[PDB]
Tab-separated table of N, CA and C in Angstrom:
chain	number	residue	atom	x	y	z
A	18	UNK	N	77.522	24.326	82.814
A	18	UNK	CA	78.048	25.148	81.738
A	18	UNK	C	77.537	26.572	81.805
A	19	UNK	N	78.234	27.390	80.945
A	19	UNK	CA	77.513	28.825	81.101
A	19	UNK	C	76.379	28.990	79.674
A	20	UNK	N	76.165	28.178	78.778
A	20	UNK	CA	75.270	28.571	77.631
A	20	UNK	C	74.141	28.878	77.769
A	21	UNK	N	73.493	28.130	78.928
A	21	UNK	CA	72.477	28.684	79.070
A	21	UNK	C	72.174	29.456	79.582
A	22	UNK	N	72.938	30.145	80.514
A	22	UNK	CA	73.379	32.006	80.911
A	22	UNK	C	73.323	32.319	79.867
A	23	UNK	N	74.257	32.272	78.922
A	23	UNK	CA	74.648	33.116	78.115
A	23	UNK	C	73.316	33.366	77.345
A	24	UNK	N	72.390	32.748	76.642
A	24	UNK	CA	71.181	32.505	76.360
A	24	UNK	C	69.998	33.640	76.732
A	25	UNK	N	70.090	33.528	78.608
A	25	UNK	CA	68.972	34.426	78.769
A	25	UNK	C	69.860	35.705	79.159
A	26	UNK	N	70.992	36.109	79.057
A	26	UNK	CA	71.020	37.479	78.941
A	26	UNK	C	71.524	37.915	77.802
A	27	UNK	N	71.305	37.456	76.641
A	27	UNK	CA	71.255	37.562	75.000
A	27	UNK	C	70.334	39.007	74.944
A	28	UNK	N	70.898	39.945	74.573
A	28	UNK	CA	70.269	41.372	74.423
A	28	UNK	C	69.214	41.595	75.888
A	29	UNK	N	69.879	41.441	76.773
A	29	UNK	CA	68.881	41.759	77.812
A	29	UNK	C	69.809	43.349	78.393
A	30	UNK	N	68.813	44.072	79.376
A	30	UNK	CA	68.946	44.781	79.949
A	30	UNK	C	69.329	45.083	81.790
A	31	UNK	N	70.000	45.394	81.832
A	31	UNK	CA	70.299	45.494	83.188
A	31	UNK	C	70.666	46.093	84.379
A	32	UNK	N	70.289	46.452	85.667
A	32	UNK	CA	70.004	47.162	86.549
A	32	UNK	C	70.768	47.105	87.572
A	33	UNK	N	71.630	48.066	88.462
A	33	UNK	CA	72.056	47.723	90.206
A	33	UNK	C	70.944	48.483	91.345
A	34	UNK	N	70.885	47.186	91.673
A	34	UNK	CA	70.044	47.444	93.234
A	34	UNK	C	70.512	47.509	94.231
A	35	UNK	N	70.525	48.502	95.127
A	35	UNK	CA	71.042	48.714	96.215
A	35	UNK	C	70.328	48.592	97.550
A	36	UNK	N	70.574	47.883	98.375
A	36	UNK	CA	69.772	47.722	99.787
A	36	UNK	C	70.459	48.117	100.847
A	37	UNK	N	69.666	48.586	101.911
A	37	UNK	CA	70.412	48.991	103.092
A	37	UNK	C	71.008	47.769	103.979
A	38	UNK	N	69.988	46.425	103.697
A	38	UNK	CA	70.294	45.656	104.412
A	38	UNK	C	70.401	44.285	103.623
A	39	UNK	N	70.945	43.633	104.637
A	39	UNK	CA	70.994	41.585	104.276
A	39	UNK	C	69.125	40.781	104.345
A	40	UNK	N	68.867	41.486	104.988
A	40	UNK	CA	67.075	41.082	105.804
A	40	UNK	C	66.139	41.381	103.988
A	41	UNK	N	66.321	42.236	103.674
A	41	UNK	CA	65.530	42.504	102.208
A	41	UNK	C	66.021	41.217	101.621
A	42	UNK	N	67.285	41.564	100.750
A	42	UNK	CA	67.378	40.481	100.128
A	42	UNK	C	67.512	38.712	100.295
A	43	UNK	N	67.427	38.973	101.561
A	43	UNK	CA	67.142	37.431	101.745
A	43	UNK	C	66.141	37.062	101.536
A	44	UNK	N	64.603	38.123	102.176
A	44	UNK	CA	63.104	37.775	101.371
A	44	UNK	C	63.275	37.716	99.806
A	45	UNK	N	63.805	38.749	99.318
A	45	UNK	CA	63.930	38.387	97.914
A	45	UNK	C	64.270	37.424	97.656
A	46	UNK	N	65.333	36.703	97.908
A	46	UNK	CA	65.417	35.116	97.251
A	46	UNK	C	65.089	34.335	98.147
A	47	UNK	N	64.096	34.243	99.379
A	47	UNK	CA	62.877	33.203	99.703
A	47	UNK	C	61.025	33.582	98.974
A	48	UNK	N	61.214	34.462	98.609
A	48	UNK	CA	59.960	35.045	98.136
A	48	UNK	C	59.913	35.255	96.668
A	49	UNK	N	60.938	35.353	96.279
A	49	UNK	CA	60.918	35.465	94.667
A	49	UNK	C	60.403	37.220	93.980
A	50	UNK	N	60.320	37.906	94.700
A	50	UNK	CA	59.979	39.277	94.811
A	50	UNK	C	61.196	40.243	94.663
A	51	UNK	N	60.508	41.733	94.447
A	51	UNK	CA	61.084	42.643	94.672
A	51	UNK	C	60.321	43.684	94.617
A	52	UNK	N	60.639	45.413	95.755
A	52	UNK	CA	59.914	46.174	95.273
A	52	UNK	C	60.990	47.605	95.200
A	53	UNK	N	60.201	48.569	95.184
A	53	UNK	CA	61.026	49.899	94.811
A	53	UNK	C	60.545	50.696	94.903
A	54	UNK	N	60.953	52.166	94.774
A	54	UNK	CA	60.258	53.663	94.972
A	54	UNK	C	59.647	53.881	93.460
A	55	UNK	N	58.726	54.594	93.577
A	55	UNK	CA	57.964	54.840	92.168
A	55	UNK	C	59.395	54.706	90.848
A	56	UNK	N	60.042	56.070	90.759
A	56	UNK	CA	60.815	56.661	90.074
A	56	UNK	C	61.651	55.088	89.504
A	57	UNK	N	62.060	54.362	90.142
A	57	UNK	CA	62.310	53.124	89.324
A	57	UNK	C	61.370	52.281	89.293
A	58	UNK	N	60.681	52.045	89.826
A	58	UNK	CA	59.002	51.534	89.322
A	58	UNK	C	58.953	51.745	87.802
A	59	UNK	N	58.693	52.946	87.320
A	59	UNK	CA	58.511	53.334	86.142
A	59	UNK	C	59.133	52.794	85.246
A	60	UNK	N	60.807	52.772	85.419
A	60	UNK	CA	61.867	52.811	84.819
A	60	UNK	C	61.964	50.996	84.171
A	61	UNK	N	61.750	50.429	85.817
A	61	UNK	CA	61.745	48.582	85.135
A	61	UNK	C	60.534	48.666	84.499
A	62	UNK	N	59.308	48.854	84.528
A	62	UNK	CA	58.097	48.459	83.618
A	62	UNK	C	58.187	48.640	82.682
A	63	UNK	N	58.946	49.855	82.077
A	63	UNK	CA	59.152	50.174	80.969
A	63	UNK	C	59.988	49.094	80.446
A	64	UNK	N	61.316	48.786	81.223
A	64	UNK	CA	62.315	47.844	80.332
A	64	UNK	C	61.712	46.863	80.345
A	65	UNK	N	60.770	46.032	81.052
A	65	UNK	CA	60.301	45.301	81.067
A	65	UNK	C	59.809	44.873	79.902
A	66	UNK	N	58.866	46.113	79.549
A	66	UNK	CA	58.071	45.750	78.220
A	66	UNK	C	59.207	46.106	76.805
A	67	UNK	N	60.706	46.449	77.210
A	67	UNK	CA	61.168	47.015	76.280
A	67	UNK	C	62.281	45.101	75.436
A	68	UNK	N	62.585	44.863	76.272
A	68	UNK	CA	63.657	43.821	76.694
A	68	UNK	C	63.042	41.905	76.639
A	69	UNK	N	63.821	41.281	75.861
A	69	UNK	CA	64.048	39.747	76.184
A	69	UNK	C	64.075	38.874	78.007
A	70	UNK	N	65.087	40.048	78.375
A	70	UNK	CA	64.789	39.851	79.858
A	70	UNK	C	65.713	41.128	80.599
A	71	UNK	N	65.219	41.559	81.408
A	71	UNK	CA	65.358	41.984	82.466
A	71	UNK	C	66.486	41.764	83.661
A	72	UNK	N	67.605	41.870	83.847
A	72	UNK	CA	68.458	41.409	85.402
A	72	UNK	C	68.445	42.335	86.371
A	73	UNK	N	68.606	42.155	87.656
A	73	UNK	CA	68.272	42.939	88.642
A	73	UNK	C	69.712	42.105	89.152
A	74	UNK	N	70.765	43.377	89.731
A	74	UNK	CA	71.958	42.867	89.978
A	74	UNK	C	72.032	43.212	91.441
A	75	UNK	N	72.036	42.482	92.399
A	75	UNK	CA	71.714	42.848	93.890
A	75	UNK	C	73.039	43.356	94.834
A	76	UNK	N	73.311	44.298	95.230
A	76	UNK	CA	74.188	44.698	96.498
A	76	UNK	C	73.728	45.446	97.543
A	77	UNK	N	74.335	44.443	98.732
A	77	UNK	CA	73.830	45.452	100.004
A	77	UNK	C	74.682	46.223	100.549
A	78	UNK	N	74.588	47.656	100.722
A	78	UNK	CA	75.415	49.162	100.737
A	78	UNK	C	76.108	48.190	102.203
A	79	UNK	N	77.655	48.875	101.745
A	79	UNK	CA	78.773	47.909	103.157
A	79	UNK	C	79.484	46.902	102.769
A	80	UNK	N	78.309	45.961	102.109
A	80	UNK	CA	78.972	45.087	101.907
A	80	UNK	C	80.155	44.658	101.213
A	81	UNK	N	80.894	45.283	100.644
A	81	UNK	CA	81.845	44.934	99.660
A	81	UNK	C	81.611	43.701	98.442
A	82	UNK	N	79.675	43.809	98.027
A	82	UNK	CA	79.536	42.328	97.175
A	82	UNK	C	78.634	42.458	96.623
A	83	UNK	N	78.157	42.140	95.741
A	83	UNK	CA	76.933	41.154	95.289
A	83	UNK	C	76.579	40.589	95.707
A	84	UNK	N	75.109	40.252	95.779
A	84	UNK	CA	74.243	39.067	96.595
A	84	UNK	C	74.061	38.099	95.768
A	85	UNK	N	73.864	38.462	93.963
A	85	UNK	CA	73.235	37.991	93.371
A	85	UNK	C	72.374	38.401	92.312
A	86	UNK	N	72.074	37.417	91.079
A	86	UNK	CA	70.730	38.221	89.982
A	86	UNK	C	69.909	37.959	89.705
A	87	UNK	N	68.583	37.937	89.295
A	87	UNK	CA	67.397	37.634	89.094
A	87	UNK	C	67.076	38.463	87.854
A	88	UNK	N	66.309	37.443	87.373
A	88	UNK	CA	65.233	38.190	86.428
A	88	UNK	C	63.510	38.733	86.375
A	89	UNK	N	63.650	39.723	85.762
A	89	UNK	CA	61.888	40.366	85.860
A	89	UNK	C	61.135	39.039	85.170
A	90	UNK	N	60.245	38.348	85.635
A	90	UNK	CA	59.262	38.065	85.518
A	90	UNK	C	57.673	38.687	85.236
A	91	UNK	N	57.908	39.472	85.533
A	91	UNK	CA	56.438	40.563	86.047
A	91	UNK	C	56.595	41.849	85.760
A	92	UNK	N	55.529	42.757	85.007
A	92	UNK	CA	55.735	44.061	85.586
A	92	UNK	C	55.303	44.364	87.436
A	93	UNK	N	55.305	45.159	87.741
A	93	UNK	CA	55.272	45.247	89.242
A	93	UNK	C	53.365	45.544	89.663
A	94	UNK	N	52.563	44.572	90.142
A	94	UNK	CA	51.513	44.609	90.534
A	94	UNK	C	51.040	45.118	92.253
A	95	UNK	N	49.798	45.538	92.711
A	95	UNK	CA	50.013	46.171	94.204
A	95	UNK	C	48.052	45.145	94.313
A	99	UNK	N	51.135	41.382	101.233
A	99	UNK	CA	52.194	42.081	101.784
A	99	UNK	C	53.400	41.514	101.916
A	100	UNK	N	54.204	42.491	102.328
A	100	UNK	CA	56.014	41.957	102.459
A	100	UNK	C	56.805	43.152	103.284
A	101	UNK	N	56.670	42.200	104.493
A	101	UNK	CA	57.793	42.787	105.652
A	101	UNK	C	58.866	43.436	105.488
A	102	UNK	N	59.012	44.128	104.332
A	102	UNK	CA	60.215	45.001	104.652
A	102	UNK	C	60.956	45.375	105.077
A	103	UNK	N	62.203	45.428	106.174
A	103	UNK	CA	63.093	46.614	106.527
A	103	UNK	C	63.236	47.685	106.032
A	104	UNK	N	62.774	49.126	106.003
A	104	UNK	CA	62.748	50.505	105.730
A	104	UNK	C	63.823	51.025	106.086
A	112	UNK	N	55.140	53.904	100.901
A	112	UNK	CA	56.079	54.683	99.895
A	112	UNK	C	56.837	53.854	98.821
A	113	UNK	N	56.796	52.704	99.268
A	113	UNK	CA	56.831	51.469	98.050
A	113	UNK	C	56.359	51.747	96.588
A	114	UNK	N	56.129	51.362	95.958
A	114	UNK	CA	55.285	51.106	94.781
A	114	UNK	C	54.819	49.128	94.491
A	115	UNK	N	54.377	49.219	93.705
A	115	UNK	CA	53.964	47.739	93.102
A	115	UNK	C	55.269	46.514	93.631
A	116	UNK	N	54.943	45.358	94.021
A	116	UNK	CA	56.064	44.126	93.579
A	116	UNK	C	55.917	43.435	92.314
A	117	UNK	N	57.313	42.847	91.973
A	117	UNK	CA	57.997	42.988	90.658
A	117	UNK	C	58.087	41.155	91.143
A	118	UNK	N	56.984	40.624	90.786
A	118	UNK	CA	57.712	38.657	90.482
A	118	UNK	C	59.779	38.844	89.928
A	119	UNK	N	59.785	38.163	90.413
A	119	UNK	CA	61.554	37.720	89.872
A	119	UNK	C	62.118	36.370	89.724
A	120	UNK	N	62.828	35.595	89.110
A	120	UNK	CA	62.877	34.596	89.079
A	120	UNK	C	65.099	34.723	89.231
A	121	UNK	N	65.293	33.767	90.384
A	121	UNK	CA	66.434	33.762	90.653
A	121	UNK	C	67.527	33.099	89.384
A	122	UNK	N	68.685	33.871	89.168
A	122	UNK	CA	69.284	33.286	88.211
A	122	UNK	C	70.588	32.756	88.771
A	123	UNK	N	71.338	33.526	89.760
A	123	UNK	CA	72.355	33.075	90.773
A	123	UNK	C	72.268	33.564	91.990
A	124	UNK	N	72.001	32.978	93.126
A	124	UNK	CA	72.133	33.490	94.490
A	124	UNK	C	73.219	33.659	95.596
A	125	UNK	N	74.985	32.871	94.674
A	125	UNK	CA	75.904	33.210	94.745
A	125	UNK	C	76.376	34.543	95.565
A	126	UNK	N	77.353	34.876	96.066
A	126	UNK	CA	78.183	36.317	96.120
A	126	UNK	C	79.316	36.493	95.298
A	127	UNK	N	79.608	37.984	94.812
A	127	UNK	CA	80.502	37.895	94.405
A	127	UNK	C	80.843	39.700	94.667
A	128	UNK	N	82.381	39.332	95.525
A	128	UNK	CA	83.115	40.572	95.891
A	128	UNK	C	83.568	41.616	94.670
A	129	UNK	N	83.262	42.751	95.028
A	129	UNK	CA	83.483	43.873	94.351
A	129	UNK	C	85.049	43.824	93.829
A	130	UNK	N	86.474	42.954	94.793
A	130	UNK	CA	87.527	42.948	94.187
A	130	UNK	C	87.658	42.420	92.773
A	131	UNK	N	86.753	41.344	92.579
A	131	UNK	CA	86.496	40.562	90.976
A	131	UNK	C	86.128	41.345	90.225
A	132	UNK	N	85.436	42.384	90.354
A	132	UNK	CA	84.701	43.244	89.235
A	132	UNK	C	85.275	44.718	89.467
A	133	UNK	N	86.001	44.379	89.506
A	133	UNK	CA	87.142	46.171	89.282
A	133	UNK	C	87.823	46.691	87.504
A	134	UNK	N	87.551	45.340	86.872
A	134	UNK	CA	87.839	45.712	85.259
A	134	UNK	C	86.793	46.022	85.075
A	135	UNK	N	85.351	46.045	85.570
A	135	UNK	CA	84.722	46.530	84.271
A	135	UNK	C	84.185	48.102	84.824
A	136	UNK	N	84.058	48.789	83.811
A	136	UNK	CA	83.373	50.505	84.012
A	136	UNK	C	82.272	50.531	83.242
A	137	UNK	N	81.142	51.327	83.916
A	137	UNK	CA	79.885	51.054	83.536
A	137	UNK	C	79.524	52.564	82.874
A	138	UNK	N	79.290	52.566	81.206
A	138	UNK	CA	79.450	53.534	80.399
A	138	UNK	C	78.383	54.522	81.081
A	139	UNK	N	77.401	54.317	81.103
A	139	UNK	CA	76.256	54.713	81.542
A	139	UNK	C	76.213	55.184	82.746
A	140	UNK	N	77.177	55.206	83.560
A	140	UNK	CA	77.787	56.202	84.780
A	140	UNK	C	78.933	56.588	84.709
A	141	UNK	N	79.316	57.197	83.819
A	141	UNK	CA	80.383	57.961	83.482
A	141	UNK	C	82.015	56.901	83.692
A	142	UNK	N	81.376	55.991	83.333
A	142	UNK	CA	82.238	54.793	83.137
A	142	UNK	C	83.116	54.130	84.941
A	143	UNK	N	82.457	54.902	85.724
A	143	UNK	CA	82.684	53.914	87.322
A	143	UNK	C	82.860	52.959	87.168
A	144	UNK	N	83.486	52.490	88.164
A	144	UNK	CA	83.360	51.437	87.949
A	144	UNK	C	81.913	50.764	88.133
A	145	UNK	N	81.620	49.434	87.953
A	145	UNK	CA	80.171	49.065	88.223
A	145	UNK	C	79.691	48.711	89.252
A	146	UNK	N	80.574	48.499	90.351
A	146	UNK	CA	79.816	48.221	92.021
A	146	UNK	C	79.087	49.619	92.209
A	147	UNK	N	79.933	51.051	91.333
A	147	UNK	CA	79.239	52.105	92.187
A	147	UNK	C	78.239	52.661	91.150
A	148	UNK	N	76.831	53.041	91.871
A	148	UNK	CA	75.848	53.843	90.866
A	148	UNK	C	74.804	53.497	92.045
A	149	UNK	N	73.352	54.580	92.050
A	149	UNK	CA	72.359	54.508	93.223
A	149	UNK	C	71.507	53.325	92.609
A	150	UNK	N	70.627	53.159	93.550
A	150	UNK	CA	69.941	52.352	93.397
A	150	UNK	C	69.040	52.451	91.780
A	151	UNK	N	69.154	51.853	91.060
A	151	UNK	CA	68.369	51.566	89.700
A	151	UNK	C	69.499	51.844	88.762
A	152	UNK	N	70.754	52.538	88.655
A	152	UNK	CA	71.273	52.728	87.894
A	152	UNK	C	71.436	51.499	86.967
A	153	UNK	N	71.038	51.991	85.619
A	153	UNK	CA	71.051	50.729	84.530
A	153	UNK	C	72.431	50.392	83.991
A	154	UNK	N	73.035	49.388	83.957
A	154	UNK	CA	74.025	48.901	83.097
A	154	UNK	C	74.182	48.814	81.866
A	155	UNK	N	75.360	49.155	81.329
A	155	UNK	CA	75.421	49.100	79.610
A	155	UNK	C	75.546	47.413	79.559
A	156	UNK	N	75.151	47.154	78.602
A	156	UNK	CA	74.810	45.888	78.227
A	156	UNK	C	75.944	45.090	78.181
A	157	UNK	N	77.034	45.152	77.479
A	157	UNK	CA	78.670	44.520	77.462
A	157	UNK	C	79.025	44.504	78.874
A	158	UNK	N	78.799	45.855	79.960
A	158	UNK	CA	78.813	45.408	81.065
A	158	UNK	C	78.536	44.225	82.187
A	159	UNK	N	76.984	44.876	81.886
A	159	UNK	CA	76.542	43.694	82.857
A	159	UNK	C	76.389	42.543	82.517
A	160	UNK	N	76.639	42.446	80.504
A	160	UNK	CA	76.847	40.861	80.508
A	160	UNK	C	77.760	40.135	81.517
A	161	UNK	N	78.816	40.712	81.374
A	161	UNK	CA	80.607	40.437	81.506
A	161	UNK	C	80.129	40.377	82.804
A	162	UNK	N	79.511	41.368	83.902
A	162	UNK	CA	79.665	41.012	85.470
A	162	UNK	C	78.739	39.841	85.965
A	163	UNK	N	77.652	39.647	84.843
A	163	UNK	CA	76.976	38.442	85.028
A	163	UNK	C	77.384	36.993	85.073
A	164	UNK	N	78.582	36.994	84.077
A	164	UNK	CA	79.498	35.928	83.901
A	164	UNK	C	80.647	35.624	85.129
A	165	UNK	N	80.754	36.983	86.090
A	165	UNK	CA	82.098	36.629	86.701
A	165	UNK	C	81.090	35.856	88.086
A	166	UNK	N	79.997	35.910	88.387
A	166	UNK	CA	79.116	35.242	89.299
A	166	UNK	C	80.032	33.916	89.646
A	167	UNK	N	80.077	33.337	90.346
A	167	UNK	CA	80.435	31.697	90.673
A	167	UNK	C	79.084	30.925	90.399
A	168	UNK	N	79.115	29.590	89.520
A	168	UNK	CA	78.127	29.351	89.029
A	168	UNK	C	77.006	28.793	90.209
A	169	UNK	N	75.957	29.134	89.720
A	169	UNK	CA	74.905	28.294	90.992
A	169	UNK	C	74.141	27.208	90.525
A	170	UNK	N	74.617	26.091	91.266
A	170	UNK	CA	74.736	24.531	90.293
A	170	UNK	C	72.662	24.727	91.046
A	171	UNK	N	72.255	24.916	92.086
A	171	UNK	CA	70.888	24.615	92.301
A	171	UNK	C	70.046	25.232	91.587
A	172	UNK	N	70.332	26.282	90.187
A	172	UNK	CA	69.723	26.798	89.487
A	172	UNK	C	69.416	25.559	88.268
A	173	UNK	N	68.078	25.656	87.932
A	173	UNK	CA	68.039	25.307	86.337
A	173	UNK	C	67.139	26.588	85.576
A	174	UNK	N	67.674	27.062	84.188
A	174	UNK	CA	67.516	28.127	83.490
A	174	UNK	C	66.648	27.705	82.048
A	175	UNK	N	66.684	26.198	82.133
A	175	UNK	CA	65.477	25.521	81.971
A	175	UNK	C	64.007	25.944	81.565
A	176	UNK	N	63.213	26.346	82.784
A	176	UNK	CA	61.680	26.866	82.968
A	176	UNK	C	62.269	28.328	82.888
A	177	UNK	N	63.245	29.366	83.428
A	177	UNK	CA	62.896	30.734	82.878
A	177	UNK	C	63.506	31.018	81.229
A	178	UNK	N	64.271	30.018	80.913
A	178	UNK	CA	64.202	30.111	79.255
A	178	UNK	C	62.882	30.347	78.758
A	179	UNK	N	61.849	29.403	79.065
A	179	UNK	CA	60.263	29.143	78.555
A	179	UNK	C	59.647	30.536	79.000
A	180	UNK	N	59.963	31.198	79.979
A	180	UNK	CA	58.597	32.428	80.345
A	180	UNK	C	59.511	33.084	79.128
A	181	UNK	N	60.392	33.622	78.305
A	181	UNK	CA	61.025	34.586	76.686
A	181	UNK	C	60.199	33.794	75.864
């Protein structure tokens, strides 16, 4: 079902991440991690402490997709092999590891970038909330998730 989605992104806040490559985010969802350049460093710690939860909405530049979303677990503490001045890693806890093509998400425009659509904005650009609910929902569901134990860390 989706309720318990719907649940943990109940007034949450939300972010697009952009990667150069497939090699990052695959550590990210074997490692449960994430990291970033200061300037959004700042930006999640803050929402972090601001927010119910946190989403981190993943695309790798090319791809025509989504990888996937996770939630902040962590503010970002200070190894991890990278593909390339870092700042801190950010715990994350996977919410769908799904793809989902940029053709599905062409209705929605993301206010908070001058209403683009929402595949496009740089790396950290935050989502208006009605947004990234709505693009959170168009995910294909990921039955190996339970939302279960990250209900309990709110």
């Amino acid at each position: 079902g989706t309720s318990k989605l719907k649940y943990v992104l109940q007034d949450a806040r939300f972010f697009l991440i952009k990667s150069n490559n497939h090699e990052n985010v695959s550590l990210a969802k074997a490692k449960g991690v994430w990291s970033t350049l200061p300037v959004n460093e700042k930006k999640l710690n803050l929402a972090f402490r601001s927010a119910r939860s946190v989403i981190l909405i993943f695309s790798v530049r090319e791809s025509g997709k989504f990888q996937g979303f996770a939630r902040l677990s962590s503010e970002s503490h200070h190894p991890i092999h990278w593909v390339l001045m870092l700042g801190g890693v950010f715990k994350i806890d996977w919410i769908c590891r799904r793809e989902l093509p940029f053709t599905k998400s062409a209705h929605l425009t993301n206010p908070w970038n001058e209403h683009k659509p929402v595949k496009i904005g740089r790396d950290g650009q935050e989502i208006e909330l009605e947004c990234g609910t709505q693009l959170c929902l168009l995910f294909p569901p990921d039955e190996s998730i339970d939302l279960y134990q990250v209900i309990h860390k709110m």
